[PDB]
Write an enzyme that holds these catalytic residues in place. Structure first.
Site, short mmCIF file in Angstrom:
data_model
loop_
_atom_site.label_atom_id
_atom_site.label_comp_id
_atom_site.label_asym_id
_atom_site.label_seq_id
_atom_site.Cartn_x
_atom_site.Cartn_y
_atom_site.Cartn_z
CG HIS B 40 10.88 -119.25 -33.18
ND1 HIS B 40 9.57 -119.14 -32.76
CD2 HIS B 40 10.86 -119.01 -34.52
CE1 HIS B 40 8.80 -118.82 -33.79
NE2 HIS B 40 9.56 -118.74 -34.87
N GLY B 142 1.22 -115.09 -34.08
CA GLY B 142 0.71 -116.44 -33.85
C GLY B 142 0.71 -117.30 -35.11
CB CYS B 144 5.96 -119.03 -36.35
SG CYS B 144 6.57 -117.37 -36.49
C1 LIG Z 1 5.60 -116.05 -35.52
C2 LIG Z 1 5.73 -116.21 -33.95
C3 LIG Z 1 4.72 -117.18 -33.30
O1 LIG Z 1 3.84 -117.74 -33.99
O2 LIG Z 1 4.67 -117.45 -31.94
C4 LIG Z 1 4.28 -116.42 -30.99
C5 LIG Z 1 2.77 -116.47 -30.64
C6 LIG Z 1 6.58 -114.97 -35.91
C7 LIG Z 1 6.21 -114.47 -37.35
C8 LIG Z 1 5.64 -113.02 -37.46
C9 LIG Z 1 4.49 -112.55 -36.54
C10 LIG Z 1 4.05 -111.23 -37.24
N1 LIG Z 1 4.19 -111.65 -38.64
C11 LIG Z 1 5.07 -112.67 -38.80
O3 LIG Z 1 5.39 -113.24 -39.87
N2 LIG Z 1 8.03 -115.14 -35.80
C12 LIG Z 1 8.73 -114.35 -34.92
O4 LIG Z 1 8.10 -113.47 -34.20
C13 LIG Z 1 10.27 -114.46 -34.75
C14 LIG Z 1 10.64 -115.27 -33.45
C15 LIG Z 1 12.15 -115.34 -33.28
C16 LIG Z 1 12.76 -116.00 -32.14
C17 LIG Z 1 14.18 -116.44 -32.22
C18 LIG Z 1 11.98 -116.22 -30.86
C19 LIG Z 1 10.73 -112.96 -34.51
C20 LIG Z 1 10.55 -111.90 -35.59
O5 LIG Z 1 10.06 -112.16 -36.72
C21 LIG Z 1 10.96 -110.45 -35.17
N3 LIG Z 1 11.93 -109.91 -36.15
C22 LIG Z 1 13.22 -110.30 -36.41
O6 LIG Z 1 13.76 -111.27 -35.80
C23 LIG Z 1 14.10 -109.63 -37.37
C24 LIG Z 1 14.55 -108.26 -37.15
C25 LIG Z 1 15.28 -108.08 -38.22
C26 LIG Z 1 16.03 -106.82 -38.57
O7 LIG Z 1 15.34 -109.12 -39.06
N4 LIG Z 1 14.54 -110.15 -38.46
C27 LIG Z 1 9.68 -109.49 -34.90
C28 LIG Z 1 8.64 -109.98 -33.83
C29 LIG Z 1 8.89 -109.20 -36.23
#
Ligand SMILES: */C(=C\C(=O)OCC)[C@H](C[C@@H]1CCNC1=O)NC(=O)[C@H](CC=C(C)C)CC(=O)[C@@H](NC(=O)c1cc(C)on1)C(C)C
Ligand SMILES: */C(=C\C(=O)OCC)[C@H](C[C@@H]1CCNC1=O)NC(=O)[C@H](CC=C(C)C)CC(=O)[C@@H](NC(=O)c1cc(C)on1)C(C)C
Lengths: 302, 302
Positions: B40, B142, B144
């Protein structure tokens, strides 16, 4: 989620070594050309309540100490005692010596412990220095010499070195200058932890964390005066809250919009009404091993 | 003392790198000449519920990825997608690549997570794969690309890579082959964790730990049949106990002298009478994130 979080242990793992005398083996910390070790590594089955380390050490020579940096062996080319530690000079400067320094921490502060055995790191977990100068660690035989530490950007601040287990199962140790935290001594005499106290400052930080986390069932419309709160704190064996503690909680207070004595008011309610089958962050206990610094570090966002 | 203990993180810290596309930066794992990353990392503000990674990736070239091993920069000289991860080949083989392997863990098993940001490790803690395929992690923006792992002697067994946060605040991710644990997908569609269950096997291990630790107030003279226990387990949302689970508890059972269905009997009492203001090891909750292996590892002595 809010988890007890330990600092990444790599910088410390590379400093762990094994140190041996007679049939006594424990861990040591290897920084530059020095290896630190609980001085009790030089005791014998005989004297355990009357050890004269002075006497015991003069009867020792450099080759009396075998220091193993894993597979490799280090040569002791000089030794000295500093308080309850031995400082062993060796002919090799640890190539992995990180940027570091020695700090003597205060009760309520937290740190990461790298539990080690025979010079081999086995686990890392977060601890707090209890108001009674002990720590609720998890240590098995062969664990003395294991160190506690904090890491800020690149500096590994060493805080603690493990020396002993008290009768209640709690642990006591020294800072890296070899001075014990607390009124303990490195000899098998029968000593005991004084009565402990809950760390008020940390619980409050934690409540702020809970709110920053999105929970706020425990809050109320009341407020209290510092002194009125301390009268309840005493009944529940909590440390008296001071103005310095209120000030430290400023940032958090701001961020959440909840005034400190208000949050106190909530805490005094929690202490009086119990949690009535409810939970905070995930606990059924008022957690006191998270400092204000730990909460900001871990909830630095929405 | 009995603490949630994480494995020493050094071997993993040296594999953490930063990976960036557009204005999207997250962490990656650098083993040999490959860097793994949640795929992603290639999404854009537009498509988040309709991402065609196939389409998104073909529109990318090697220089489309900036990989930073700290101060240094690594050059991407080839890329591919494997399930939900991108495998980036680079012109430098990580000099700190430890002995390692990829394992897909089962629900109830535990592992250490090295929470990282911008390729910089910030904390390590122990987790368990919940029966519902999520984990109760502590992750901020930040995070993932952060990985989960276990270390046996020298092999770092990588289990997990973080991908997302679900609506309840729990986390979902994949193994190192990029297959998600659970029925989750890497797209912003609105998904939700299924109902979870308490991990029966682990609680029992924990009770054995408590007894190995010297506590045994909860024990009783009763016994139960597997089936009778499972009828109570169901009422309290615990996983059904199986003969395999009873067998796994053999060693511990032996060491403490308490038969498994006896220990069960005690657990069924705990679940029925509550803990009546009492504590086990230090909890007021029946802890289920310690496996039989975790208990032996940590109580290997008197
Ligand atoms: C880590 C993202 C990253 O490190 O890069 C950007 C700097 C992240 C994990 C999160 C951050 C807050 N705590 C965590 O564990 N992953 C994501 O933000 C994914 C990215 C997805 C794509 C395809 C780009 C998105 C999510 O986690 C989002 N929520 C959902 O997708 C979701 C909604 C429902 C309902 O079920 N799942 C939000 C941003 C939380
Ligand atoms: C670590 C010893 C070591 O690593 O080397 C041997 C291989 C050890 C810490 C213990 C081990 C179990 N869990 C722990 O935390 N430290 C000690 O055993 C000290 C050694 C002391 C000298 C001077 C040689 C001894 C103790 O901790 C003993 N208890 C007490 O001294 C004591 C009694 C009372 C009362 O108050 N303190 C016992 C062996 C526990």
């Amino acid at each position: 989620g809010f988890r007890k979080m330990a600092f990444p242990s790599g910088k410390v793992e590379g400093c762990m070594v094994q140190v041996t005398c007679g049939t006594t083996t424990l861990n040591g910390l290897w920084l530059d050309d020095t290896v630190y070790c609980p001085r009790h590594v030089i005791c014998t089955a005989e004297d355990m309540l009357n050890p004269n380390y002075e006497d015991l050490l003069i009867r020792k020579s450099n080759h009396s100490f075998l220091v193993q940096a894993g597979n490799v062996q280090l040569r002791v080319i000089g030794h000295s005692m500093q308080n309850c530690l031995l400082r062993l000079k060796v002919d090799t400067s640890n190539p992995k010596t990180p940027k570091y320094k020695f700090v003597r921490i205060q009760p309520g502060q937290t740190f990461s412990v790298l539990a080690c055995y025979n010079g081999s790191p086995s686990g890392v977990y977060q601890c707090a220095m209890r108001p009674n100068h002990t720590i609720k660690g998890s240590f098995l035989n062969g664990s003395c010499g294991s160190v506690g530490f904090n890491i800020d950007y690149d500096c590994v601040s060493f805080c603690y070195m493990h020396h002993m287990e008290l009768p209640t199962g709690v642990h006591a140790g020294t800072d890296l200058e070899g001075k014990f935290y607390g009124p303990f001594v490195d000899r098998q005499t029968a000593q005991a932890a004084g009565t402990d106290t809950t760390i008020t400052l940390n619980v409050l930080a934690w409540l702020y964390a809970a709110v920053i986390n999105g929970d706020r069932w425990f809050l109320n419309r009341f407020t209290t005066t510092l002194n009125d709160f301390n009268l309840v704190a005493m009944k529940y064996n909590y440390e008296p809250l001071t103005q310095d503690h209120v000030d430290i909680l400023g940032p958090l207070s701001a961020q959440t919009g909840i005034a400190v004595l208000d949050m106190c008011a909530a805490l005094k309610e929690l202490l009086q009404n119990g949690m009535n089958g409810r939970t905070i962050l995930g606990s059924t206990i008022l957690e006191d091993e998270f400092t204000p610094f730990d909460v900001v570090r871990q909830c630095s966002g929405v």
